[PDB]
Design a protein around this motif. Structure first.
Motif, short mmCIF file in Angstrom:
data_model
loop_
_atom_site.label_atom_id
_atom_site.label_comp_id
_atom_site.label_asym_id
_atom_site.label_seq_id
_atom_site.Cartn_x
_atom_site.Cartn_y
_atom_site.Cartn_z
N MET B 115 60.21 -57.30 -7.08
CA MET B 115 58.85 -57.79 -7.27
C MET B 115 58.29 -58.44 -6.01
SD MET B 115 58.43 -59.46 -11.05
CE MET B 115 57.06 -60.55 -10.68
N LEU B 116 59.11 -59.18 -5.26
CA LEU B 116 58.57 -60.00 -4.18
C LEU B 116 58.75 -59.41 -2.79
CD1 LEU B 116 59.22 -63.71 -5.16
CD2 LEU B 116 57.31 -62.20 -5.66
N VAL B 119 56.84 -54.77 -2.58
CA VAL B 119 55.77 -55.17 -3.48
C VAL B 119 55.35 -54.02 -4.39
CG1 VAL B 119 53.40 -55.93 -3.58
CG2 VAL B 119 54.96 -57.02 -2.01
N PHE B 120 55.15 -52.83 -3.82
CA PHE B 120 54.63 -51.71 -4.59
C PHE B 120 55.69 -51.16 -5.54
CE2 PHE B 120 52.84 -51.67 -0.28
CZ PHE B 120 51.53 -51.98 -0.57
N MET B 193 57.56 -68.46 -2.29
CA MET B 193 56.62 -69.32 -3.00
C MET B 193 56.05 -70.38 -2.07
SD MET B 193 57.52 -70.32 -6.91
CE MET B 193 58.02 -69.13 -8.15
N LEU B 200 47.02 -68.95 -0.69
CA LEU B 200 46.22 -69.25 -1.87
C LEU B 200 46.19 -70.76 -2.09
CD1 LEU B 200 48.29 -70.02 -4.51
CD2 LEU B 200 48.66 -67.55 -4.45
N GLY B 216 58.47 -73.58 -12.20
CA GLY B 216 58.90 -72.20 -12.01
C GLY B 216 60.40 -72.07 -11.83
N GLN D 176 38.58 -69.67 -5.55
CA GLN D 176 39.85 -69.72 -6.27
C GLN D 176 40.22 -68.34 -6.82
OE1 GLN D 176 41.74 -72.50 -5.88
NE2 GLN D 176 43.20 -70.94 -6.58
N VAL D 200 46.42 -55.10 1.23
CA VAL D 200 46.66 -54.72 -0.16
C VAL D 200 48.03 -55.22 -0.62
CG1 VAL D 200 47.01 -52.76 -1.69
CG2 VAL D 200 45.08 -52.78 -0.12
N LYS D 201 49.05 -55.11 0.24
CA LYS D 201 50.37 -55.61 -0.11
C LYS D 201 50.35 -57.11 -0.33
CE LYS D 201 55.18 -55.59 1.38
NZ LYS D 201 56.17 -55.06 2.35
N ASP D 202 49.60 -57.85 0.49
CA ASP D 202 49.49 -59.29 0.30
C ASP D 202 48.79 -59.63 -1.01
OD1 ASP D 202 49.71 -62.08 1.51
OD2 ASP D 202 47.54 -61.95 1.22
N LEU D 205 51.19 -58.95 -3.79
CA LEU D 205 52.24 -59.96 -3.76
C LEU D 205 51.77 -61.27 -4.37
CD1 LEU D 205 54.95 -61.31 -2.52
CD2 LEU D 205 53.50 -61.72 -0.54
N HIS D 206 50.50 -61.65 -4.15
CA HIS D 206 49.94 -62.89 -4.77
C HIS D 206 49.76 -62.67 -6.26
CE1 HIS D 206 48.28 -64.82 -0.82
NE2 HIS D 206 49.56 -64.57 -0.79
N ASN D 208 51.82 -60.81 -8.09
CA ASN D 208 53.18 -60.94 -8.61
C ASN D 208 53.64 -62.40 -8.61
OD1 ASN D 208 53.09 -58.19 -8.80
ND2 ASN D 208 54.88 -57.81 -7.51
N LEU D 209 53.29 -63.15 -7.56
CA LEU D 209 53.69 -64.55 -7.48
C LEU D 209 53.02 -65.40 -8.55
CD1 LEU D 209 53.86 -65.56 -3.69
CD2 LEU D 209 55.68 -65.79 -5.39
N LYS D 210 51.79 -65.06 -8.92
CA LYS D 210 51.08 -65.86 -9.92
C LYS D 210 51.73 -65.79 -11.29
CE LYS D 210 47.52 -66.28 -8.17
NZ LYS D 210 46.24 -66.13 -7.44
N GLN D 211 52.50 -64.74 -11.58
CA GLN D 211 53.17 -64.63 -12.87
C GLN D 211 54.47 -65.42 -12.94
OE1 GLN D 211 53.83 -60.47 -13.57
NE2 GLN D 211 51.73 -59.87 -13.04
N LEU D 212 55.01 -65.83 -11.80
CA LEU D 212 56.26 -66.57 -11.75
C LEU D 212 56.07 -68.08 -11.83
CD1 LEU D 212 57.87 -64.08 -11.44
CD2 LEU D 212 58.64 -64.83 -9.20
N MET D 213 54.87 -68.57 -11.53
CA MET D 213 54.60 -70.00 -11.50
C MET D 213 54.03 -70.52 -12.81
SD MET D 213 53.40 -70.73 -7.62
CE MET D 213 51.79 -69.95 -7.55
N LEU D 214 53.96 -69.67 -13.84
CA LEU D 214 53.42 -70.05 -15.15
C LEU D 214 51.99 -70.56 -15.04
CD1 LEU D 214 56.56 -71.85 -16.67
CD2 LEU D 214 56.11 -69.41 -16.37
N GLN D 215 51.27 -70.08 -14.02
CA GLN D 215 49.85 -70.48 -13.81
C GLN D 215 48.94 -69.39 -14.38
OE1 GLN D 215 49.00 -71.39 -9.74
NE2 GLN D 215 50.52 -73.03 -9.61
#
Ligand SMILES: CC(C)CCC[C@@H](C)[C@H]1CC[C@H]2[C@@H]3CC=C4C[C@@H](O)CC[C@]4(C)[C@H]3CC[C@]12C
Ligand SMILES: CC(C)CCC[C@@H](C)[C@H]1CC[C@H]2[C@@H]3CC=C4C[C@@H](O)CC[C@]4(C)[C@H]3CC[C@]12C
Lengths: 338, 276, 53, 215
Positions: B115-116, B119-120, B193, B200, B216, D176, D200-202, D205-206, D208-215
């Motif tokens: 996943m990290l 990416v694709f 992370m 972001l 997390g 945001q 696009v990869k970035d 990746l953001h 995918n990361l947003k699903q791991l932080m429970l946000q």
């Protein structure tokens, strides 16, 4: 001088308004005050049609009341058998941007259109059993928004270039062009006798067209926003409208006026589709709040709710014999209610 | 009876007269019962709804199924030493199902990497490879171990593997390797992370970001199974704390899995609301 | 101009038609609904023995 | 009787098999919407890639399928029904960074496009073309003659580049959401795909990361 012409137009508008005020003697509610209510309409889902890979934009029932065709954004047309939940055909499309689908009254052809500004006719019952393109109707300068069949050789289409056309399939050329709309035309409904049709555009106006002569007979106004859906009453002397102002309206052709409004204070979302019942007592409207409401067409009261979809409802239609209702949504599913 | 700390014990622990054994077995029973209930709820949740289906839902579901079966067998047949035939079978079943649970735990970290870092997505489907790995690793390990020594599948104190002849390492070693791999994957995940939390919402209170990161990490620790390392350090009565930590964090694993992946997720809650 | 003249012509065409009373139209709609009430499976639920679905 | 049922079931099964086969390809496809004007240089950018109504272009970067959609003439539609492009991954915006007269019109178009409700789950890539033409212009022609609300020397290319970047960035009220990426290209650069790829990869990746932080 154009000022004299503007004064003439204003005078004619005032005369029409005065005539309409003169004709209004009583309201539909007062007349249909003592009619007993329909009650509570509880419908359950009977069939769920799965297999599309993207959002579903259009659908059309068959005259035989068994087969229907649906269009999705994945770029494919699928023809289903409602009774057995079976896929009969799968038609890949050249363009992935589809907004319309139509089914021939005889069941031999299927029409399609979208952002490519072309309408394509597919021959279902062909030699060797391979659905292939038969015609490509070109000549529009905007995206195709609606299309309806008159017979195996005549189709009427509407586009975003504020024009409607009547086509000859065997030739590929427009027989007639219906101009007069200011905004983009979004909806289209055929009269039961197939001699008149009604149209709704983004100018908050509706027009009655003559297929034979090719002119506009009446213009209906009253909505405060764009019109997305339109349908004809079963007998053919009235029609219903659906707009983004979260209201539905009923107009009469002979009286040239409005008769009733179907709105509630808890509804703020716009209507995406509208349909009528076999007898005309029930009016069905689809909203983009993931919900569909059933109205009492004579008393303007809510009678039921069809809450099964988890995304916006885009298409809706009632079968010819009036037995089932099929709804499509952005969740890539079709549900059949009864 | 027997406590949960015998699974990770390469030495025979001698117990001084006290209340440690009774408290440990009480904690084991309570934790396993409540974890069984929570695991059943999680299995139904992951198998029923069609809007939750993905490549990670399968891993979650298989992990929950294996944990449920293994803990049920543990509560049923760990004190049946008076039966000369049932006991080796119970030990072998426990071995297989715990190994399967750990294989799916490793597949969790492999999913984190896929996943990290890459990416694709892939052109083919990885479900067949997941099912091959997570069910052929335990089968091969248990078959090879039973081929060499099959009299080591019963002990005079419990229905588990022998200790004197190093037969407990056939279970301990693979777990240690999986734990090391999961530690590496978790370190990579935390580094990503931290690095990409400054892109972001680049400027924010440092406290809230730490809260998000620790939440997390807590969510990921239930699936990575890194809290099994306490049992490796329980060697005598001096380090009795390790047994307590092991039996507390590991007998309630189903509870943590439920809490973090069925009740603090918006998708599951909205599906349950849809059922209402 | 031509556009204003065409608009005036269309307005004149639409301004001279025989309009009927609203009450007559409402009565006609009610009469149709009452006459075709028995043939609506959605308004009146039918037994499952005759339901294709 | 039974033969017709068997034939219908077989046909439905084959159709389902075909749809299942194409689902995997559908899942891993990246769609980016191409916007801009005539002076931006979309034609040269598309022609020099080196691997009607709506035009679509297909290309592959590092074994990843890509698709570029160019609305073109139909972009003039201002109705909400035209916003069916809510499933795209990113939006590629082309402007000309060598004509200061059209800069305010480009800024207005960027504001209108970006500040739309349907474009809430998409990222924005901004390409600032004609940097070579800008380099010869920042000296002979002063940027201060059109934007009297900037601070810094006008004969420095870097300062005016930062000024333009800030001008385009400050028009976004959705701070945001998926981030905004900007580049200084020339529409002929041979490295114009290895930037969209990374952006696009970035973005993914953001996601995918947003699903791991429970946000
Ligand atoms: C799915 C697989 C792992 C489960 C099968 C069990 C495997 C692990 C094997 C390995 C060792 C085996 C045991 C070894 C010895 C005996 C004693 C004999 O008198 C009866 C069979 C019995 C009791 C065997 C039962 C099955 C057994 C426990
Ligand atoms: C797929 C498998 C082979 C991967 C590796 C598994 C490891 C952990 C297993 C496989 C076979 C196992 C061995 C099988 C039999 C014995 C003999 C006994 O007197 C001591 C333990 C010992 C020596 C085991 C140690 C652990 C072992 C090496």
């Amino acid at each position: 001088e154009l000022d004299q012409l503007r004064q003439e137009a204003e005078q004619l508008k005032n005369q029409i308004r005065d005539a309409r005020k003169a004709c209004a003697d009583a309201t539909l509610s007062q007349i249909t005050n003592n009619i007993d209510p329909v009650g509570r309409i509880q419908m359950r889902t009977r069939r769920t049609l799965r297999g599309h890979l993207a959002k579903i934009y259009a659908m059309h029932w068959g005259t035989d009341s068994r087969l229907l065709v649906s269009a999705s954004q994945d770029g494919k047309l699928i023809i289903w058998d409602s009774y057995t939940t079976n896929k009969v055909h799968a038609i890949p499309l050249r363009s992935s941007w589809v907004m319309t689908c139509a089914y021939a009254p005889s069941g031999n052809y299927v029409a399609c259109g979208g952002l490519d500004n072309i309408c394509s006719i597919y021959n279902l019952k062909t030699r060797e059993g391979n659905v292939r393109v038969s015609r490509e109707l070109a000549g529009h300068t905007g995206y195709l928004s609606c299309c309806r069949f008159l017979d195996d050789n005549q189709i009427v289409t509407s586009s975003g270039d504020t024009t409607c056309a009547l086509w000859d399939i065997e030739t590929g050329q427009q027989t007639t062009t219906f101009t007069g709309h200011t905004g983009d035309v979004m909806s289209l409904s055929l009269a039961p006798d197939t001699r008149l049709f009604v149209s709704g555009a983004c100018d908050a106006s509706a027009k009655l067209w003559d297929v034979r002569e090719g002119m506009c007979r009446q213009t209906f106004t009253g909505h405060e926003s764009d019109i997305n859906a339109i349908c004809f009453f079963p007998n053919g002397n009235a029609f219903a409208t659906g707009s983004d102002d979260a209201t539905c309206r009923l107009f009469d052709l002979r009286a040239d006026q409005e008769l009733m409004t179907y709105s509630h204070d808890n509804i703020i979302c716009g209507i995406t589709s509208v349909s009528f019942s076999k007898s005309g007592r029930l009016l069905l409207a689809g909203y983009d709040d993931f919900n569909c409401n059933v109205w009492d067409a004579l008393k303007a009261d809510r009678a039921g709710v069809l809450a099964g979809h988890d995304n916006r409802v885009s298409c809706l239609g009632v079968t010819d014999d009036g037995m089932a209702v099929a709804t499509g949504s952005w969740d890539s599913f079709l549900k059949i209610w009864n | 009876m027997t406590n949960f700390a015998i699974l990770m014990a390469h030495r025979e622990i001698a117990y001084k007269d006290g209340v440690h054994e009774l408290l440990l077995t009480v904690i084991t029973w309570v934790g396993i019962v409540i974890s069984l209930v929570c695991l059943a709820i999680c299995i139904f949740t992951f198998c029923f709804f069609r809007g939750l289906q993905s490549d990670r839902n399968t891993i979650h579901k298989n992990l929950c199924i294996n944990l449920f079966i293994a803990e049920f067998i543990f509560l049923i047949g760990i004190d049946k030493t008076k039966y000369a035939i049932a006991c080796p079978i119970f030990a072998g079943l426990l071995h297989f199902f715990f190994l399967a649970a750990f294989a799916w735990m490793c597949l969790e970290g492999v999913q984190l990497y896929l996943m990290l870092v890459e990416v694709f997505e892939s052109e083919y489907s990885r479900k067949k490879y997941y099912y091959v790995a997570g069910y052929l690793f335990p089968a091969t390990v248990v078959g090879v171990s039973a081929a060499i020594d099959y009299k080591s599948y019963g002990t005079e104190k419990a229905c588990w593997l022998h200790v004197d002849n190093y037969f407990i390492w056939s279970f301990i070693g693979p777990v240690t390797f999986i734990i090391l791999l999961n530690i590496i994957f978790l370190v990579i995940t935390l580094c990503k992370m931290v690095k990409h939390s400054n892109t972001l919402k680049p400027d924010s209170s440092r406290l809230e970001n730490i809260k998000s990161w620790v939440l997390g990490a807590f969510a990921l620790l239930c699936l990575l199974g890194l809290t099994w390392s306490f049992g490796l350090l329980f060697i005598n009565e001096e380090t009795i704390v390790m047994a307590y930590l092991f039996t507390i964090f590991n007998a309630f694993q189903g509870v943590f899995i439920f809490i973090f992946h069925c009740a603090l997720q918006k998708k599951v809650r909205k599906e349950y609301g849809k059922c209402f | 101009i031509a556009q204003a003249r065409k608009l005036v012509e269309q307005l004149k065409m639409e301004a001279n038609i025989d309009r009927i009373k609203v009450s007559k139209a409402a009565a006609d709609l009610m009469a149709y609904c009452e006459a075709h009430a028995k043939e609506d499976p959605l308004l009146t639920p039918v037994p499952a023995s005759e339901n294709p679905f | 009787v039974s033969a017709e049922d068997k034939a219908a079931a077989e046909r439905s099964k084959e159709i389902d098999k075909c749809l299942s086969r194409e689902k995997t390809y559908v899942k891993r496809l990246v769609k980016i919407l191409l916007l801009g004007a005539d002076n931006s240089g979309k034609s040269t950018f598309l022609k020099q890639m080196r691997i009607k109504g709506i035009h679509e272009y297909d290309f592959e970067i590092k074994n990843v399928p890509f698709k570029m959609v160019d609305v073109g003439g139909q972009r003039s539609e201002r109705k909400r029904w035209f916003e069916c492009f809510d499933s795209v991954t990113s939006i590629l915006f082309l402007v000309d960074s060598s004509d200061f007269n059209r800069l305010t019109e480009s800024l207005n178009d960027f504001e209108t496009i970006v500040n739309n409700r349907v474009f809430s789950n998409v990222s924005i890539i901004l390409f600032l073309n004609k940097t070579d033409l800008l380099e010869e212009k920042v000296q002979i022609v002063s940027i201060k003659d059109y934007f009297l609300e900037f601070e810094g020397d006008p004969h420095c290319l870097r300062d005016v580049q930062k000024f333009l970047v800030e001008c385009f960035r400050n028009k976004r009220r959705d701070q945001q959401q998926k981030p905004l990426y900007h580049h200084f290209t020339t529409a002929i650069n041979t490295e114009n795909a290895r930037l969209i790829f990374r952006d696009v990869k970035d973005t993914i990746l953001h996601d995918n990361l947003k699903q791991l932080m429970l946000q």
